[PDB]
Symmetry: D3
Subunit: 320 residues, 6 copies
């Protein structure tokens, strides 16, 4: 349904960002750095036997305390590599045993809970906090605070996510040379923002990323969650320029252009949640060394368990 | 799809409420009465010629400044009857010309904007404000703060709605003894809550009401917006009792049992958004003088323009 | 889904019409003009207080008696501007209170009932009369009489609509310098025909118009009502040429080319009932002074209440 | 989805008809008998080799001229049994080769074309003619003239169908002792009316019959074509009694109670077009010697080709 | 939704087939020819009066016994033309009275039952016979797809070639007027037969399935082509193997080889058999040919209108 | 959409089985046990670090070689408890890393691949082996349905009995602490195994499929039960035969025979495995039993919540 693959490979649409994109993010991170990280780990009583699980609490946007899990595989090596895992839309940190893959492959896993979500497919424990008034919005998180980038929901999520990497680095068994940031869909868009904003991330795993090339996305598909934006615009006919102006500060295509760390991307060519031209726009602008795995017959599931193995191989080669 | 009509007419299921229902609402309304109402009626340069439109501002929940419209028909009479109109889900106050029916029929119409909504089918101008943290929730308003009646979104809306009647009553041309409260679906549910809580309303028009008999609604239909609650429960599997206990404080059936003013209801027997058993449970417990118009072949549109005529006729006979 | 906007703005495709288009309409109108118009305005008992309502009857196609409403706002004006309102597919004149907008804005409103429809979303009271046998057709109006323009349903509707403006001009309070023809969807298609054929209309309001560019419409979308045509062709496989020949006499694109009066159009770029390339073919051929309001994120709702405000402003400027 | 089979077999609901049902039909048929039948059989040039095909014209309702086919198998017998075949909704007489079953089984087949349809799945050639004005209606045939039994579409169809049997009987090779009336769905409904009204039919084949038990059909399913009725009622909310009064004169259940000839019925227990309770109401009231083939897993296809073999066996046995 | 008609009429995509396409089919057919055909025509007791019905059995793939019907119109001419009819997906031979058209128009009709199907819209009586039946998506499109030797349509298409030999064995059949016909799956089968059989005299190919698989699975998500897509969604490592297998069964590759006169039909709104897949086959078809294009029809194609076009085409051809 | 919970709890519909149910299964198992089990566990090179992964092969129905995974958590304890895991419809054994839950909780996990499937949501490696494959609707539900001896699930349930024997043969498995587990199709398989094998100590049965077929096909039109209804729509003469065959594979009939402690789960909004079908099996289950009821869940059931319940249930059992 989207551009054919040879056009996708060369798709580099003109980028739109405001003159103060960097300043906005510098100011944001500076203000939140004024609050101590105060990363706290508490070993959980758990039935898990191959992994130690810890409850995590750390300061994200404006000192707000974000939950996480830290999963440490019970192995002989002193320092371990670490994957910081961001969660898809309407998910949350769930139970420790929901996140066994990376530890089973020998990596400490830091799972960041997602402020205010945690109610669609996997439970969460972290609340959101708005700046002040909660403006008229369409149901969901995509239009929460959308009339100003200072009030926009993903400002708070992305800052949480940058601080999560510092929180992971605070665990002494983490090898700070081998901290990976990872996610799919919303998780992928979060990780992409982190890949540009974090000083500590060493590699990026970015699967079927959401939060990319918003203007084209709402023109291309009527699926959720991009359709929250479209539905808002159907009602607020006077706010089109403001909406896209705000979203430009959160668009993965704009972060991709600033990111320098090694990355592995994936894309499903039949994905109508995260359309491939949106994924390719981010991938093609990504400034660091990069590869993409292309799944021509998959929808939003992308490469699934095949991709998981591709990721393990990729990291092993990068870090060897 | 629901109970047959002769069973609907006798459907009076056992009500569930906590022992402190009245105290919860007494304390809520008392706390908000501590801020001055400070009703503002600012004439709006509209192009309307048979109606004068005012931009309304008034203090609702905890002093928070709620928007609205006041439309005054251009008539001889010094004291006119008034309809206070509440709005369907995802709507808001829109334009003054969206609410011409009651003014055209000789009634001043006070349209209350809906905090935080106004983004699905008609725009709105009024923000929400959470108590404190914004808990994990499913997209929308149904599960916003659902873990405690003190934090629940409809606490705020219903309080606004009570205060709206006091605001309308402040308008010098409003006849204090002919103030009607009206709404369809969400609007119906809000009006029902107000019919129990306000002491200033003379009559209720309650069309295809939402926010009624939650426990049963989520068993009967998988439509939105009831499905928000179901979807929250699908994830937060431990929270059934808490969710239903919170919702008991906001259930139209429990307000209906308290309401003493004359009411005209309407119901569509094929409505799968507000299922007939939910509307009938409310109607059957409604403690004031009452009638219901039954539309057996209509879905959620109910009686539409026919029902509007029934309303005008009902109010005319009542006020004689 | 249709042509991108830069292409829609330049889209002026080869028109298809028979050499005898004008003759066909000259003869149609002359033939119906032999019967006296005989417009009848019966003041009605009404609950309405700001408006006087009349039950209308007038002679349309071949003297057949068409129903309407006349809504006159109660203002201190010896003459008032007038909107002649045409109605969407499957609608009818409903109740007087269904048409309050234009009276509220200070316009006498003549609502034309639609022959034979009035059964889908708002009731009507006027029958159709065929031009002899009622040929095999697909359910609906789009294919009724389609094998010959002389028998086609829209020949009668459009005649009626032209005659409606003459009937409005016959009410003494109407300001014949300020007669507007308006409609959305089917309404807009009717209004486009009237804009070419009427000697009385002074401005056109044409929203999301239907009955435009039929040949392209059926190639682009499978929605109703355009799909009635496609479904008829799926069965009458021998009638492609005849069907498109008939429809060319009723196509808004060919009327647009003949229209001289000022117009305000609207279009939704996500409209899949009236595709944007069909609306733009009509608009780009429209030969009078014109403007278009473009709603990029809206579907068939177009600009809704925002567009209603644009219309009032447009007409005040035009007529000032 | 409907009553279980054990209850369907005992399902004999309270009937509803007007006291003048028989008078209405007697007057109807007497008036149309005043026009000469003048059955015209024109032998066609055909590629068919086992069958002789004739183009039929005969006088139906009020002398109106109805098309048909007559298919005569090339056999030694001088007199042959005859099946008069009525056609499903939106179909028409199509081509001679569409109707080969019965002639291949050694039956002359008279295929009656259906006035005004013929545009959905098989073409037709016969126009409808209204009783003057064609009232406001929902698209299709179900609500055409529904406000008065004298104007209702199926008054003209059922009269045509009775006259079709008279026309078939007129062909010299037909054995008037072995005239069968047959149809499925709309065809079955028509054939049921004809089993009560024709003095010439000798056996009925009635598959998955439509036009039965209208009041219950519209409560049970939202499929077309019954939904044409529900949709008209959703708009004409003041016409519920009148609509069902009109429909009582055309209801297969009411004809079944009057029919004397032997019949074979079929029913699909998962048929949501003609729900099983509607079909059983008709079968249970049928007053001639009868049998029903019950297909528990089939939808509206019923028994398909299996039922065709049942019919052949049933007729062989009956005709001795 | 597909290429516009002007483009479809000259759509001639580069073909993909293995070097051994012909050898594969030659070996396949020679191995099945080592088993005797043994056509069996059992005259049936029937309620049909204008035709004589026979219960057919013959040997298709590797001597496996395939069911069918033979319908013989009762006519004074001793040698009659014959149509060998293939059946659409999820159908089977049904009852003899399901197939009255061609006999009513004076043609003997040999109806080939379809191995292992017969359970969606019309019943069938003939089993499939595979060794191991590999992991597959529900249905027939992916059965044995990892090797052309094990692929389901190897067996169907062999059956279908053998069916023409079985029809020709019937003594009233005029061997100079044997037609092969079908729609959708039937048309894809008939298209393979048009290349592989030395006995067919003409081809009726409506709305053909089993054509241009690579494009088909990119263009539509309908069944049955979506069985292949779904298999590929799970077996991510088998993309090249899957399309290599399918190339041996692709109508476009058969059409390039076929020589007999043919009448095609296509629906421009068909989303089961997309018009570009039909036109790729039609444009490569190497025999004298015509196509009836129905711009507004979906997969129903020309329906009863096309049936008339078929009878006329054959009349003119055989006269 | 199904019976209200109060009635589901009381739903004990009359069971239907043939008088030779036990004899059929005795003969089936005895016939397959005449072939050597021959379990092979080949240690693999893997990226996993906390677990040892083995490629498994063993002899299921009639000596047919079935694939599997064996995942061993790297722990001090020498003889570990073991969960034998059966897979959902259209899945297969996938990758070793697809099954980390039980090993991470301290259980060796034996994952049985499902013959012939492995192509819808997770890949598989094991073929089916039928002679003739009768007319069927696409999928596995109607494959060989005209005779219980030829029916697809005769082969799967035998494989699944055999899997337990194969798990028991691995040296690190505590042969006295083996659990059987599955969801949906996996739950139906495990329910059969709870009746047919005496090796297992407990049953984990989530959202079970293959239960109360006669009712299932009347209540829902979803797949995979609809495969049965669709076959019946066409094979109108085979209704009695179809339901006779299915009675030999109905979880309600196996439940009545099972004795081991069981933990069930049900979603009251599940329209794939309707609550009445699940309660009919649960209500007849003869052993010590409990059911976790998820009133707002569809076919996902309890998801990770239910997994926690499972770990607690097994901990209590094995203390
Ligand atoms: Cl013909």
């Amino acid at each position: 349904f989207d551009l054919p693959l040879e056009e996708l490979k060369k798709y580099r649409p003109e980028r739109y960002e405001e003159k103060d994109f960097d300043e906005f993010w510098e100011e944001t991170l500076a203000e939140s750095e004024k609050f101590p990280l105060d990363p706290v780990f508490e070993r959980m009583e758990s039935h898990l036997k191959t992994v130690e699980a810890y409850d995590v609490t750390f300061s994200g946007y404006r000192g707000q305390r974000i939950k996480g899990w830290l999963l440490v595989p019970k192995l002989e090596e002193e320092k371990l590599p670490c994957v910081v895992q961001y969660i898809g839309y309407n998910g949350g940190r769930g139970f420790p045993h929901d996140w066994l893959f990376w530890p089973s492959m020998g990596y400490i896993c830091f799972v960041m809970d997602t402020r205010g979500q945690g109610s669609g497919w996997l439970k969460g424990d972290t609340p959101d906090y708005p700046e002040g008034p909660v403006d008229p919005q369409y149901p969901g998180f995509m239009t929460r605070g959308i009339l100003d980038p200072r009030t926009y929901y993903y400002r708070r999520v992305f800052t949480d996510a940058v601080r999560a990497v510092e929180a992971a680095a605070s665990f002494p068994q983490v090898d700070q040379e081998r901290i990976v940031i990872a996610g799919g869909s919303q998780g992928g868009g979060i990780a992409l923002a982190v890949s540009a904003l974090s000083k500590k991330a060493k590699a990026l795993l970015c699967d079927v990323p959401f939060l990319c090339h918003f203007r084209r996305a709402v023109q291309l598909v009527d699926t959720h969650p991009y359709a929250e934006i479209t539905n808002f615009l159907k009602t607020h006919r006077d706010k089109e320029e403001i909406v896209f102006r705000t979203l430009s500060y959160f668009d993965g295509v704009n972060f991709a252009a600033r990111a320098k760390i090694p990355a592995l991307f994936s894309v499903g060519l039949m994905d109508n949640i995260c359309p491939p031209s949106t994924v390719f726009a981010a991938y093609n602008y990504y400034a660091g060394p990069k590869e993409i795995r292309i799944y021509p017959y998959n929808n939003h599931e992308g490469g699934g368990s095949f991709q998981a193995v591709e990721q393990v191989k990729f990291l092993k080669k990068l870090f060897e």
